[PDB]
Amino acid sequence: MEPTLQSILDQRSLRWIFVGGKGGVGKTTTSCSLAIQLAKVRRSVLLLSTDPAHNLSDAFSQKFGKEARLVEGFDNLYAMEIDPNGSMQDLLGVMQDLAYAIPGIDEAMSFAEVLKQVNSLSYETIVFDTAPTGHTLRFLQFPTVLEKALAKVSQLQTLSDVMEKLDSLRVTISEVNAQFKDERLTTFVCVCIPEFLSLYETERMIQELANYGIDTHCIVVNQLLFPKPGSDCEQCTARRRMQKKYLDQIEELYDEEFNVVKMPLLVEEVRGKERLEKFSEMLIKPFVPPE
Amino acid sequence: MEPTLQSILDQRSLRWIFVGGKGGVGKTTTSCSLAIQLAKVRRSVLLLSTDPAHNLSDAFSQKFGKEARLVEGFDNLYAMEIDPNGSMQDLLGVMQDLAYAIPGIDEAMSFAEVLKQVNSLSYETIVFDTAPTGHTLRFLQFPTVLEKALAKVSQTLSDVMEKLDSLRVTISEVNAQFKDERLTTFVCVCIPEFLSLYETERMIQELANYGIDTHCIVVNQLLFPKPGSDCEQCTARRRMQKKYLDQIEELYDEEFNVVKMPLLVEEVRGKERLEKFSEMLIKPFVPPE
Amino acid sequence: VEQAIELALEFFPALRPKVAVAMRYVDVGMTLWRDVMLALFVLGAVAWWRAMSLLLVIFLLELVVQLVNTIGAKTINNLLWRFYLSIPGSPLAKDFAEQRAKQKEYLQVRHDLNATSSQDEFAKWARLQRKHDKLMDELEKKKSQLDAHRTSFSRKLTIYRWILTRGMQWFLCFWFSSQPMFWLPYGWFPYWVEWLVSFPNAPMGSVSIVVWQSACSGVLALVIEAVMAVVR
Amino acid sequence: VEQAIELALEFFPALRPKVAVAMRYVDVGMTLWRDVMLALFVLGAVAWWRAMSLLLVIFLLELVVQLVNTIGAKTINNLLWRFYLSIPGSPLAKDFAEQRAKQKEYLQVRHDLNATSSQDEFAKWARLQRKHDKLMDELEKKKSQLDAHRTSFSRKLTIYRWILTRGMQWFLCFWFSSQPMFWLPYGWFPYWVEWLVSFPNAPMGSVSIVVWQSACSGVLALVIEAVMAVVR
Ligand SMILES: [Zn+2]
């Protein structure tokens, strides 16, 4: 297919963008590159991070917290790196026993008030980033968790207040899960690298969303080193040779109805505004040497 | 700790060796490198593999089937790169209906007939190779599956019941031949990236959750910087490889051993080319780092 | 129940064998009562050879009570299994054969899966894995369908047999009750014992059909235990 | 049960209203039987005002039968919960407090786990994961221990109450049986009704304590249903 994300730019009805995978791939570079390339043709784009690597500060040399702001060099770059532990710090006794009753309660309530802060403003689009999958993917099950929570407390200070609060959380999370499966404003991208296990857990994630009814069409890869003309490292040649072997299998599956984004590793951990602009520009014009 | 496998050498009462991990690591080359210096001080060592990649064809350019034999240049290299699906070939209507309640049948029967042929002879030591881990360690449930197989039924019927009773007592003694720790060992492999460290860490407590320890961990493809010559890719690759490498040094260096095995140019084939690669497992090469 | 925790709580308090001995003597009356019903069934059985139809109705009910004893509440449906391995016009057995056919493709693709390699056919690896979990969901859909139909079929045929059982367990007492089955010899039984006949409306001096209903199950029951000596 | 699928299978075969009418007449005897036990309870209740201690024994047994009705076989142990939230010298409640304390360290380290990062503290990552599954196994060990002790304590106290219940349900008939509880008016009941007093050895014309044992539970039972109108 077309090796870019131009179709992600072209649909004006898009609202929500999901991006993830596993570690060791540098998802933050893809995140901020996607954000800045979206800022070229969009109005109000907000980034949000919950991964405990507080990486956007390292991306821009500026401390962020629990409130959005505009950062320098841009009129559209807004972000606030937050923590999921703040709601349990708000819990810091019976609600701890409720958190023992089901292995997850407070993270969904934090996610809910996060999304209320999200829908407080009038922003155009947003993007995401997450941890490893076993702690990530339970946010799709947060409606079933809150269904179990209300089924539990319906059998179990005034309890009517927390009943009406949990009912507001119920209707809000139902609107969020309903917005998830609409697919005209919610998309998902995944990343990986040329080795076995990185490719392995990728289809596990794809069939996971297949058993939840969310498709995709775009998959990004990383560190695809193409040889310099003339100059050669002898171990780099064998690394490229084995890299193409896993590359062509991903062609052997996803060339039908998916997109492949070739991205080479650069010599520096790309920071600075202009360097991130040049790094982001390659996600529209794909570089291809003769191979 | 000691950067070798010397505790495996001088033991000499070991009988069983479990080495696996995840793909993309060339673990079969590590197993053959282990077995070569194994047979240098031993008498009767047999290799058994069950992974569908017939890597020993690449290892010695000599086809191995369903019988043991000896390859040239050795007096003790014995192997048979068999498939478990021959037991499925052995099953080609009630027996086929038995696959419903228990999805694994032929694998236990394969371990029956193989370990019977193994314990038929008097070989000193054996070596192994396995599939990915969630399909690997489900063989530990074979005593539980045969427990419920005998509970399912408990003269065309009782003869197979007595045959499965013989399989029961044999698998119970072999499982009793497992936790002895003086003849059964386990070595895992890894490579410097995130997910390989992740699933190796997930692997370890599984053998801890079954009462089997370990002390030997091998890594692979450890790149070394060239003096004088330099590639700009290899510098940052050395940095990333160090980043996790130092993270494992905080992990296991009090009750485990670390093996440094550097990458070579090509897939090392042939006996004489493999000998120099197998040399590094005892005398560990160390550049100034 | 254990008579040991009851003794563990008997220490909390500080006659009893008099009632213990006085209770055990009552079972002798019921055992010799069934022994005299055995002797009267012997004398009722001898009187038929030298000499009607209702006794043959009880004769069939004895084999009904025997099947009540050697009942397999699953093994009746084990007869229903070969009952439904017979009819080619069955709608359900068609999908049962499609179930076994899908099981054949299941084990076939699983053989092609484990026979395949995870290195150089990774696209075929994933296509096999997708077909694997494709069929794995439709597998137990039939286990939910047919086993539901089977337990409903059991719930039908339990009552279908139970009508044939208790309809004869209550018809015999409805009809042919006043009509005397046979006359007791004059003077053998006390007046109060003869009353039993009087309550179901049958004339005094004849017997009803109860001990023939219930206690004749014991008559063949020892012959049932005779078979316990035959095989064992 | 529905009497409609039974009619759907009644078409397979080709009297019945005679048994249908003959069965319905038997309930009149039991309804007028309970109405005469109501009248004898009225006359037994009138005889106490103009006139002793065994009526107060029945008075306590009425509240025992009431608790038998409004029994919570779990809610008795709900009383046992505050029974064992009281004693500081309890050995088991000490480990129950240690259970809640370990639960506090569990949720604490789980917070420090999810608060931590999986990149640059991977050794602390694994040490947290190991402590996590360290405590996760000891968690349900106490669920196996204390809930076992709790269900055994329930099995003790069920019989511990059952002794206090049926000891009064049978002692009353053991002792003070021949000794007459009260005398029936001469000529009100036929000789055959007086039969009941004659069997427990009490003199003819007086009553025993059975209908006071069993059917007085119905006397307060309507007052029990009076409470059904109180809350609802
Ligand atoms: Zn290089």
Numbering used by the authors:
A (entry chain A): 14 to 105, 120 to 183, 205 to 339
B (entry chain B): 14 to 105, 120 to 181, 205 to 339
C (entry chain C), D (entry chain D): 300 to 313, 321 to 357, 1001 to 1181
Can you provide the manuscript's text about this entry?
The eukaryotic guided entry of tail-anchored proteins (GET) pathway mediates the biogenesis of tail-anchored (TA) membrane proteins at the endoplasmic reticulum. In the cytosol, the Get3 chaperone captures the TA protein substrate and delivers it to the Get1/Get2 membrane protein complex (GET insertase), which then inserts the substrate via a membrane-embedded hydrophilic groove. Within the membrane targeting stages of the GET pathway, the homodimeric ATPase Get3 (also called TRC40 in metazoans) adopts closed and open conformations in response to nucleotide load and interactions with other pathway components, allowing binding and release of the TA protein respectively. However, the cryo-EM structures and native mass spectrometry of hsGet1/Get2 and scGet1/Get2 show they form a 2:2 heterotetramer, which is stabilised by Get3 and interfacial lipid binding and is important for efficient TA protein insertion.
To further investigate the conformation of the GET insertase from another organism, we took advantage of the thermostability of Get1, Get2 and Get3 proteins from the thermophilic fungus Chaetomium thermophilum. A heterodimeric fusion with the flexible N-terminus of Get2 truncated (ctGet2ΔN-Get1) was recombinantly produced from S. cerevisiae and complexed with apo ctGet3 purified from Escherichia coli. We subsequently obtained single-particle cryo-EM reconstructions of both amphipol- and nanodisc-reconstituted ctGet2ΔN-Get1/Get3 at an overall resolution of 5.0 Å and 4.6 Å respectively. However, the reconstruction in amphipol additionally revealed two ~60 Å bridging helices tilted at 75o relative to the membrane normal that brace these three-TMD halves on either side (red helix). Notably, our comparison revealed the long bridging helices to be ctGet2 TMD3, which adopt the same conformation relative to ctGet1 as in hsGet1/Get2. Despite the conserved core fold, the overall morphology of the ctGet1/Get2 heterotetramer is strikingly different from the wild type human structure, as a large central membrane cavity separates the heterodimer halves. In addition, the hydrophilic groove from each heterodimer half points towards the central membrane cavity rather than to the outside, as observed in the hsGet1/Get2 heterotetramer. Finally, ctGet2 helix α3’ and the adjoining TMD3 N-terminus form the sole contact between ctGet1/Get2 heterodimers with an interface of only ~120 Å2, binding the opposing ctGet1 TMD2 instead of the ctGet3 TABD. Superimposition of ctGet3 with hsGet3 demonstrates that these changes are caused by a ~17o twist and tilt of the ctGet1 coiled-coil. Nevertheless, the structures of the wild type C. thermophilum and Δα3’ H. sapiens GET insertases represent analogous, alternative conformations of a largely conserved membrane heterotetramer, which we define as state 1.
